[PDB]
């Protein structure tokens, strides 16, 4: 009397970390081999990573990852001959929504702190994207899922609307660039912004770059209407 396990569908947002624990104990008997992939494929989608030890599927989507991703969770057993005998399979989907999909009053501007990095997210694995977000937490002091990580667009390494900003350690920018940002508050000004010494000083001195693993081009604080 086989048992079947349904897994609920999930949602993700371009530029925001994604994490879901997968109930592998319900799916795998002791001695089974768990595989997690794009449905019908061997690999996961390019934005996702499977952490076997923690039973966690995690990722950081790009704009090119928008749409629905079907994910297969399978259990197999080795035959005496080494063949992979399939045992059971459960499929769910994750829909990746555009960057703007994700408090401040309606239309009230959001004050955002952005760190500009000499990096190319399209050349980073999903684990590398997530690890960078983790390493920024010492400086942002926010939870992993409350930072945003997207590419530079139009090759613009600066924001002329910023009312506070400062330099990083980089002198030459080699890659397209990445923007790692988080919210400070609603419609703030220089005098309501919180203490940012813990961002500005390690950015300029190179301590932030040494911890993140990428050169820091600069940082800025600007008010944005969504």
UniProtKB/Swiss-Prot annotation:
Compartments, record wording: Secreted, Extracellular space
Glycosylation sites: 3, 81
Region (O-glycosylated at one site): 103-122
Cystine crosslinks: 104-186
PTM characteristics: O-glycosylated. POMGNT1 catalyzes the initial addition of N-acetylglucosamine, giving rise to the GlcNAc(beta1-2)Man(alpha1-)O-Ser/Thr moiety and thus providing the necessary basis for the addition of further carbohydrate moieties. Heavily O-glycosylated comprising of up to two thirds of its mass and the carbohydrate composition differs depending on tissue type. Mucin-type O-glycosylation is important for ligand binding activity. O-mannosylation is found in high abundance in both brain and muscle where the most abundant glycan is Sia-alpha-2-3-Gal-beta-1-4-Glc-NAc-beta-1-2-Man.
Role, per record: Extracellular peripheral glycoprotein that acts as a receptor for extracellular matrix proteins containing laminin-G domains. Receptor for laminin-2 (LAMA2) and agrin in peripheral nerve Schwann cells. Also acts as a receptor for laminin LAMA5. (Microbial infection) Acts as a receptor for lassa virus and lymphocytic choriomeningitis virus glycoprotein and class C new-world arenaviruses. Acts as a Schwann cell receptor for Mycobacterium leprae, the causative organism of leprosy, but only in the presence of the G-domain of LAMA2.
Protein name as annotated: Alpha-dystroglycan
Classification lineage: Eukaryota, Metazoa, Chordata, Craniata, Vertebrata
Gene: DAG1
